[PDB]
């Protein structure tokens, strides 16, 4: 929604635990204010999949809506001489980090959110693999999203789904099969999804479909310089609510529209809806869908 990209589905919380100095503008993200964990996602060019589904949830939003669980540990001490459990996963990802970030976050192989973190006064290097003393006067307050992805709630069981890629010996940290022969190696942009009770599923092809609907997250509302408005205060047709609302024809097909007396205006959010993905011939409803650039090894 051209003007409502900051009118977030769900709670709209774009912070990472332990970095709460940006909560005024990140918890929630809304029309006013800058949020270092979220604004980078709307820079055109970057995150083209998320911008195609920008009314779906971010990774941090999904975590705070309890759609995606936090990894344990939730953050990896990058500088630590003893190593850390993210290191292997991070090193197979080719990523670019702007300066002044102390933290960056990603969906790990378990389908949980992990993060790499520097000590205070240190920033992530441009490949996000090391920490160095900060180059600026101050660090950003949030965490850089390392993957181009979007999320949604889902109860579709994915326990049986696994990565299937033709002629791939290894993708990311996943060994699909041992290859006796000479292999080629490349950094490739690979689509992936995570499902309920599944690990990360890499795919040869991204095939998605959206069913539009009239559920609450399919709308954005604002006071009638925008101020957002919580649609749960709007009465359904024939129902009760704490405020009076109006909106477009889609909204008024489901909610009672009061026109003159309205406190708010509600618009259907462009591109919102139930997303499904085709995985090895079968359509499933994922929790998150994304791209990431990882090392892929293929039989020659």
């Amino acid at each position, epitope marked *: 929604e051209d003007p409502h990209l900051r009118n977030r589905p769900g709670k709209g919380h774009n912070y990472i635990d332990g970095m*709460t*100095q940006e909560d*005024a*503008t*990140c918890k*929630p993200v809304t029309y006013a*204010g800058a949020c270092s964990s979220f604004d980078v996602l709307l820079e055109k060019g970057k995150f083209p999949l998320f911008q195609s589904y920008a009314h779906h949830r971010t990774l941090l939003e999904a975590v705070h809506d309890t759609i995606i669980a936090k990894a344990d540990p939730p953050s990896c001490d990058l500088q630590s001489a003893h190593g850390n459990p993210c290191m292997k996963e991070k090193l197979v990802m080719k990523t670019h980090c702007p300066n002044d970030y102390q933290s960056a976050h990603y969906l790990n192989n378990d389908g949980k959110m992990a993060s790499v973190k520097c000590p205070p*006064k240190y920033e992530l290097t441009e490949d996000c693999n090391f920490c160095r003393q900060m180059t600026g006067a101050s*660090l950003k307050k949030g965490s850089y999203p390392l993957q181009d992805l979007f999320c949604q709630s889902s109860e579709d069981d994915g326990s049986k789904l696994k990565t299937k890629m033709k002629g791939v010996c290894e993708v990311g940290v996943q060994a699909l099969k041992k290859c006796d022969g000479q292999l080629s190696t490349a950094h490739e942009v690979v689509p992936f999804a995570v499902f309920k009770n599944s690990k990360k599923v890499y795919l040869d092809k991204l095939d998605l479909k959206t069913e539009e609907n009239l559920l609450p997250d399919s709308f954005v509302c604002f006071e009638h310089e925008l101020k957002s408005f919580d649609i749960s205060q709007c009465p359904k047709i024939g129902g009760h609510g704490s405020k009076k609302c109006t909106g477009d024809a889609a909204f008024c097909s489901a909610y009672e529209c009061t026109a003159q007396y309205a406190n708010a205006y509600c618009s259907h959010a462009n591109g919102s809806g139930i997303v499904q993905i085709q995985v090895s011939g079968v359509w499933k409803k994922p929790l998150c869908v994304g791209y990431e650039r990882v090392v892929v090894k293929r039989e020659l």
Partner: antibody
Amino acid sequence: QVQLQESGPGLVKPSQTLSLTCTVSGGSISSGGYYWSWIRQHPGKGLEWIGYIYDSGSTYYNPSLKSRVTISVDTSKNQFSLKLSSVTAADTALYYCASLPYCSGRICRPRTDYWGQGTLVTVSS
Amino acid sequence: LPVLTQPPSSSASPGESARLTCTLPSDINVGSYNIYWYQQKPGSPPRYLLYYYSDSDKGQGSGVPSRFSGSKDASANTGILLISGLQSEDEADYYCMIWPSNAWVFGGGTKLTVLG
């Protein structure tokens, strides 16, 4: 805009439980993402945070006091309350309820701080 | 839990500038936090003056004169309140405050006397 008003006994006996209530008018303690707090100040001394609620759903306490302190909420009456157990002469203080801003990027929530006038509590037999 | 140390008293003359310090303990870093400053005059609750995170992320309290400003000293791990063009009405107690996750931490406060 928002106004806060403390209510309570003024006198409590040693080892008893101090109970106080804050009534909020002009805004709702149940939405907006605001923090609603208890803070005390012994006359002639500093400020000590006791605990707060975030909207009406989560509660966090000063760790040095947590074992003696409960905060509860009455969303229907727009009130929150404090219970401090095992009181000693060291608990004699002026007890404020307050909502203080958190800020980032020039945006502050709330845009200004709100304080009640405070209620004086003397611990004495 | 962390202790914010403020000097118990300070003093300066009209038109001078008062510099008040708030030193964080060595295990946390001043660069990480919004620093909030509060003023308390006799008979009133404390009042929010301003917050400071960085030169590009800072704000003044509504109705608080511009002559109050905040800054940080990374090497000394201190937050600083600078009161320029000191006026008689500025005699007060000043408290610094930080807001780590799930806590409010107040400094001990500095009693500022305006001389002369």
